[PDB]
Every structure is written in structure tokens, then in C-alpha cells.
Amino acid sequence: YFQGAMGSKPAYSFHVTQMQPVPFPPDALIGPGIPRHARQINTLNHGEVVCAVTISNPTRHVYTGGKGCVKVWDISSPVSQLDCLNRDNYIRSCKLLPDGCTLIVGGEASTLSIWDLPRIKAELTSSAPACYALAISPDSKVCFSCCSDGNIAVWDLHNQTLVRQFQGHTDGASCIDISNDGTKLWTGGLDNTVRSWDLREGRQLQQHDFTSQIFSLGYCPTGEWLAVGMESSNVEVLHVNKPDKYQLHLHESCVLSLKFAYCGKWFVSTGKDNLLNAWRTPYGASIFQSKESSSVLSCDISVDDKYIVTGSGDKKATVYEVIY
């Protein structure tokens, strides 16, 4: 059993309009659905840099993406291994379909493997040499892939056919999220921009320009907010429509992953600086911080918000139990 203890830090969360520190409301650090802390419960010794992590629904299995393979762990040694691509190249993203019987694996290879849960059901073949990020539509019919050439590939998962290729981003598309169904696509890139896309009419809506590259992004499940993890080490929380934005300074290096909890009240960000930071939506009050042994490359939160899994540069994954 653990108990809260209040700390303070020099001003790290600012309102941008020029910067002014955020005066936190009383429900910033404590409230229903607000975690008190995160407790490490497992270490998954993958043995390769873990670039992608996904948690099963219901929570039982953890999928870790390393060099050439996906390892499946029973969190109640791997229970199985999924060989997807050349054992010299990294898996960059693996997404489960809502039901949980299908897994889509992307990486440093031209093909996306669709696994039945195990064997390869099908293989979508792209023109691009690599996939850096994947997103599945809430309806489980479409898959969005962020290509190395900056394009966004739109796949029809039923017929295993390409439907379209968005304008993307120049130099590479690094991250993706779907808008609370499911008409807007948000992508980030190495061209210092975040772009929104009309999924019904098929093309670009908005463009947010930044001073550095975007490595991660998340769309708030209760809507309104988009959280952006940058090369600069800053996290920016922008309103989709309003001009108000927050700038968060608790990372000392690149913000590599970002994930909102399903209730939308809080989110996590992970850095090259060994930190997993939990933040209050939207002004970024610091809920908890966990320091790891190496760079934290990827993260996932279970659909019930009870567990967090992180992928590490120390060639492992860590499972945390979120304590309320």
C-alpha cells in the first residue's frame, strides 16, 4: 500500500498566448479517476529494443515489438513468438483489433502482417520501405499506416486492398491518432507539422506548425485536446478549435511516446531522458513520474485504465499497475 505525498517543482506548465505559469484548479492532482501512483508489477525481458507495445482486451497478454519479432507475454518467459519480418529490422507498431483476435504489425519492412490469434492471415504490401506508426478505425474496417516517404496509406482490412494515399508530410510521418469516432485523422511528422485529415472527403483540413519535429501525438478520447510530443523535449496540449495551448516542461530529452487514458482525464508521455510522466488533461499538472533504467520508447494503457506498459532502450518492457 502507497499514500500520496505532495511535492513542488519550479513552474513546468505554461499557458501560451508568450508564456504564463498555469494556476492549478483543486482537481488538478487529486480526483475520481485520477491515479495516485503506478506500481511496477512485471519486467518482460524481450532482449531487443522494445519499439512497440500493446495490451490485450481483456487484459491478460502483452505484445512487445523488437528486432524481427513480436513476443506475447501472459501477465497473470513469453508464451509465444510471432516472426513478422527480417530478424535484423525493428517492429515499429503493433495494433490489436477491438475484438482482440487480430493483430496488425508494422515496421522496418515494406509489408504489414495481419496475424490471427497463431499464423499470418494476410500481408498488406506497401510501396514505402518502412511503416513508422499504425492506427485502426473504431469500426475495425480500416488501417492507417504512416510511411517513411511521408505518405499515409489507407487500407481496407476486409479485402486487404489499398484505398488511398494521403499527401502526408515531407521527410516522414512519425505518429498518428483517430478523433471519439472517427471522422478525423491527426498525423505528425519530421516536417515540424501536425495535420488533420477529413476521413469522409479524403484530404487535409488543418495544419499546426512547430519549431521542432513531432515524434508523438494523442487525441483526447473525450475530444477537444490534442497532445504533441516533440524533439525539443516539450509536450504541447492544443485545443482542436480554440487558440489556447499549454506547454509542458518535465522532459530533458525527446518525447518519444504519448498516450491518453481512455477516460481522457490524464495522459502519459515517455522520453529519451528515462522518464514516464503522467499528466492531468489539459493543463499538464504532474500526477506521477516514474524513472526507468533507459530511454522509454513506447507505451500503451489498457482499455480499463488499470495498466500501463512501456518499451525500453534497456531491451525490455515494464508493466505497471495504475493505483487509484
Added chain:
Amino acid sequence: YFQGAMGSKPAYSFHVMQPVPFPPDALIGPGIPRHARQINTLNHGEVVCAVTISNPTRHVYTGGKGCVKVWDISKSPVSQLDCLNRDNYIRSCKLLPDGCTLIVGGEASTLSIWDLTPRIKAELTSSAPACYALAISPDSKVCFSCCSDGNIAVWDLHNQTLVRQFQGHTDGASCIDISGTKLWTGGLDNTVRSWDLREGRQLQQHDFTSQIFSLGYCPTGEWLAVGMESSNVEVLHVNKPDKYQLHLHESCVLSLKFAYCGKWFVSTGKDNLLNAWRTPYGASIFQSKESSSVLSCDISVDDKYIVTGSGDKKATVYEVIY
């Protein structure tokens, strides 16, 4: 400017044991500090055993070896009060409500009464070889002194005469606080005793597993906080059987002081730590690590400042930030 950031620790606050589930106003609320910022260092040069702050806040009084130093906190002392002799420590110094008088107690049979060039107005002479703690009545007429022999001497400050000597403890009386009808005293006999000030007799007795070094009575009533030799802080209800046991010290809890609003309190240890706690279940508000043992503490009447006395032969002034 500073912003709050939530942290967690393995269970350190228990209901007497079961860990305390904190309510939402435990770590955040009006009158609950966010943090404490060091603003001054007072280089006394002797271990600072007693610290008291003027009302209104302007001057801080630090008690060391045969010397009280006066500091204007608005880095060098503005004045010095030499308590003869210079070889013994000042254990307690309490100002009278107005602020023009200072009662100095310590490792000597006499209590000096200073007029505020400052001079010694009078000297109350006790039979005991030392005074470990002082408390002044709200009316400014009586002074209670905790003697080394375990007795509680009651002094009439106007006539400089002893009125009575309470049974005290079977061993030394180390600490004291006024409820202004009930006196609470702690001792080296592992007990906390309450005294009827109107009838002049002993009301209650709380028995502990180790010696009591410090104690405080919550200004809004109900709670008594006890700092112990075991390193534990215990918060006992005056009437109910419920009690809290706090474990954030690794060594003797040497001083303890409630904020005047009664919502929070501080405790200091031989372990170099200053801890701020939520009344009554002891949620950890802030912690400050010092360079040496923290022997004494005071909080200003407005709850804006904390002063601590250190084993590193100095005092530190903190500004409490809300």
C-alpha cells in the same frame, strides 16, 4: 514561481495498524501550503536550541550557548542578549503577546526576563537545575516551566513568585502546550499528562512505548501531536480513542509545532528533516532536508514563515507559499 507535483511513498500514516485512506482535501485546499522556500540563513554560531518569532513578524530570536541573537528578517544580528554564563544552552525563549518581554529558560536554575539597550528586568529562581520547556498563558500573567526533576513550576510573572509545582512526571518534563484551562505536558517517563489549570490537578494520562521529546495542541482543539524518541509522530484525539501514527522520521522527533489555523503542523528531527503534515491523519504536505539535526522550530502567527534551529549552528527562515 512553483507548481505542485504529486508523489507517493510506501504507507507512512496509520490508524491505530491500518494505513489511512486520505480524503480529497488531505494534500490540497485553502490554507494548505504548496511549498516552503528558504529565504534566510541566520549564522548564530552555536547550536540553535530555541527559536521564537515576533508578532507582528519582523524579528526572529535564536537561542544558543549563553546568548540570544535578534534578527531583522525584512543576515547579521541587530542585537545580542548575553545570558550569563556563556557555557550553558538556552532551551526555550518565549515572547509575551505584546512583544516587549522575553522569558529565557535553559541549562541553569534561573529563568531570565528580558526587557526589549535591552536589559534583564528580573530573574525567577527555581530549585531545579534546568528548564527544558516554557509556555505562557494567553493572559500573559503566568509562565509554565518544565523542570529537569519532572516538575511543572507555575510562575506569577507580575510578582516574580512561584504559585505551585504540578506532580509533573516520574522523570523529566521535556515539553508543554496550553489548550487556556488545560495544560498538556510530555516527559521522559513515556507519558503525556493533562492538567486542570483552574482546580490545579491531573486530568488524563497517555502511556507510550518510548520517551516524548515534543508535543503540540491543535489550535482549533481536538488533537494532540506527540513527537517521540522512537522517531514516530503520534496524533491522539483528546477524548476519542482514535489515534494516528506517522512514520516519516528515521530518528528522534526533537520539535513539533501546529500552524495557528490548526490545519497543518511541522515536526523536526535528529534525521535532518523538517516535515509538514495535514491535521489530523498526517498526509505529507512538504519535506525539507537540512544540513544537520533540526532541533527547534516556530511558525509565525499569520502562518507565513517557519524558522528552524539547527545542529549546524544556524537558523533557517522559510516563507510558506500558498
